[PDB]
């Protein structure tokens, strides 16, 4: 878990399976006893620890003396989802979908080709996967998030055409599978109630957007009172108006109302 894939890595590497190699495993790095050759007893915790900690740091491991990228930041996680949505759905297809939806309210899908339908479905699937991956980092960074990225949280979902759940829509159901066979081993961050955690995360980020808007308004009012004059900047006025209209419209699109 140390060398292969971290906590918020979009990669999937089975740490005990060498599927990214162009050569048979000749030498075993982490070896404790001479009897580790004919039966390495790998998979046991006390030996896979040695092996995966003797493995060298990869591009995502960010070795000690090397700098470590800021990943737990909401202001970086939001543009990640936005760029993934842009990589999934192109601008032309996005405009076509927006026009079709605003014209027929999800009733004239026959105009879209089957290839475009499959592109939309694959984009929604990849967005759901990356949200499931970033969920712990998002719940970590929700504390000190900024209003722009809190709104981008809904902007990216709208762009990817994924309606967030609220107590098309693809975050409503879980992946089918019997709980007795599903993977539950510790150490691997894998949420099991995605429609239940993303919904409360959306509620929390709505409350956070409300708090940030109220904080901006209170700071503006305190500045005006300290100046003892009603002299507001045109940039600030236009920004407040456009951000209010934008948050209203983009939350009404998802279905959440302040």
């Amino acid at each position: 878990v140390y060398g292969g894939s971290g906590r918020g890595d979009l990669l999937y590497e089975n740490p005990d399976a060498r599927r990214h190699s162009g050569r048979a495993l000749g030498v075993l790095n982490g070896v404790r006893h001479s009897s580790q050759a004919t039966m390495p007893e790998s998979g046991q915790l006390y030996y896979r620890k040695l092996i995966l900690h003797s493995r060298p740091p990869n591009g995502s491991c960010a070795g000690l003396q090397r700098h470590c990228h800021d990943t737990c930041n909401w202001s970086y996680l939001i543009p990640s989802l936005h760029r993934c949505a842009e990589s999934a759905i192109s601008a032309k297809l996005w405009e076509k979908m927006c026009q079709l939806g605003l014209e027929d309210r999800s009733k004239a899908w026959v105009n879209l080709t089957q290839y475009e339908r499959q592109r939309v479905r694959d984009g929604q699937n990849l967005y759901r996967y990356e949200v499931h991956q970033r969920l712990p980092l998002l719940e970590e960074s929700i504390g000190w998030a900024q209003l722009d990225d809190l709104l981008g949280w809904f902007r990216s979902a709208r762009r990817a055409w994924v309606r967030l759940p609220t107590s098309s829509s693809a975050m409503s159901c879980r992946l089918e599978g019997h709980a007795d066979s599903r993977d539950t081993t510790p150490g691997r961050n894998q949420v099991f109630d995605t429609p239940e955690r993303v919904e409360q995360l959306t509620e929390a980020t709505v409350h956070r957007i409300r708090e940030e808007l109220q904080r901006l308004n209170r700071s503006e009012r305190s500045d005006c009172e300290g100046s003892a004059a009603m002299r507001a900047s045109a940039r600030r006025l236009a920004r407040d108006e456009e951000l209010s209209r934008c948050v209203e419209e983009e939350l009404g699109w998802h279905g959440v109302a302040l």
Partner: protein, 181 residues
């Protein structure tokens, strides 16, 4: 079930409370001698027993506790040492590599020593004493007195020996207490 029995009521009443508390047992099983305790686990040689089964160990060379110890020559009887088979698996592989420097023949023999891991659950001891036995004389005493020493022991200081290496005075002269009282 851990009580002592003897046709002498006095010695029975004297030795009954001395058989309480934790007890260890030196046992003989699988051609090996182990020292089992109330909660100690041991890996005995491969036994044809199903995992998660309660078993009892027959041979018991010795039993002991913080106050007593019963030896068996050669074996003991009345000791109920019950364990539970925790698992059954191979141990660490030993690789025997036989190579003759004269000829061209190398033999690689792997030996995974199979063994059953067990956890000793409970240990009970209930002996049948015959009577108080004298140490310095083979005669078996007909009476038992918990106050008087069954064998008085005296210091070793004669004075006849001039070169006798003298220890400290309190080490040479130090009586003992009475445990049975």
């Amino acid at each position: 079930a851990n009580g002592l029995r003897c046709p002498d009521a006095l010695i029975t009443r004297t030795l009954n409370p001395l058989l309480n508390g934790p007890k260890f047992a030196v046992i003989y099983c699988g051609n090996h001698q182990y020292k089992v305790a109330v909660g100690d686990v041991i890996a005995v040689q491969r036994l044809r027993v199903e995992i998660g089964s309660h078993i009892a160990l027959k041979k018991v060379l010795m039993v002991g506790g913080p106050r007593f110890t019963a030896i068996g020559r050669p074996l003991l009887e009345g000791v109920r040492v019950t364990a539970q088979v925790e698992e059954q698996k191979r141990m660490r592989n030993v690789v025997s590599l036989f190579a003759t420097p004269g000829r061209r023949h190398v033999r690689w023999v792997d030996a995974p020593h199979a063994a059953t891991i067990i956890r000793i659950c409970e240990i009970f001891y209930s002996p049948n004493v015959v009577g108080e036995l004298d140490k310095y004389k083979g005669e078996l005493l007909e009476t038992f007195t918990p106050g008087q020493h069954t064998n008085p022991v005296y210091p070793v200081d004669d004075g006849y020996d001039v070169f006798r290496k003298k220890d400290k005075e309190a080490m040479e002269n130090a009586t003992t207490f009475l445990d049975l009282l």
